C-alpha cells in the first residue's frame, strides 16, 4: 500500500496530510530555537517553502539532493502556503534526482 502523493499545485488546502518528494534548491541554517531549519523544495510541479521544527529532531538536508517527505502537514503562511515538518514525519534520501532543471540543452554539458 503506497502513500498518497500530492502535488504542490494540488495543495489548495492547508492543514492537509499527504506525502511529497522534492529536492532542496536552497537551505538556510536557523540559529533560533523555535526554528531549526528552513529552505525551498524544488518539485517538478513547482516550488514551495517548508520549515522544520526542532521538536521534530530531524537531520539537516543536503542541497541539490532529492528528499522524500512522508506524513507531513500543510501550514497556512499569510497569503502563501508552506509545508511544516514535525514529529511522526520521516525523511529518506533518493538516488534518483528530479528534473527541476529543463529549458536549454546545447550539444552536451
Boundaries of domain holding 104: 1-109
Look up residue 70 and give its three cell numbers.
Answer: 512522508
Count of other CB atoms within 10 angstroms of residue 23? 23
Q: Domain tally for the chain?
A: 1
The CATH number that applies at residue 84 is: 2.40.50.140
Rounded-to-integer distance, Cα 97 and Cα 78, Å? 31
SS3 labels along 21-61: EEEEEEEEECCCCCEEEEEEEEECCEEEEEEEEHHHCCCCC
Q: What grid cell was written down for 49?
A: 517553502
Amino acid at each position: 500500500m503506497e502513500p498518497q502523493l500530492t502535488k504542490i499545485v494540488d495543495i489548495v488546502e492547508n492543514g492537509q496530510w499527504a506525502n511529497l518528494k522534492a529536492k532542496v534548491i536552497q537551505l538556510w541554517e536557523n540559529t533560533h530555537e523555535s526554528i531549526s531549519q528552513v529552505g525551498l523544495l524544488g518539485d517538478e510541479t513547482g516550488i514551495i517553502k517548508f520549515t522544520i521544527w526542532k521538536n521534530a529532531e530531524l537531520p539537516l538536508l543536503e542541497q541539490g539532493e532529492s528528499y522524500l517527505l512522508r506524513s507531513v502537514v500543510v501550514g497556512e503562511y499569510n497569503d502563501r502556503f508552506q509545508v511544516q515538518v514535525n514529529k511522526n514525519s520521516s525523511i529518506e534520501k533518493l538516488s534518483e534526482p528530479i528534473e527541476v532543471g529543463l529549458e536549454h540543452h546545447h550539444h552536451h554539458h
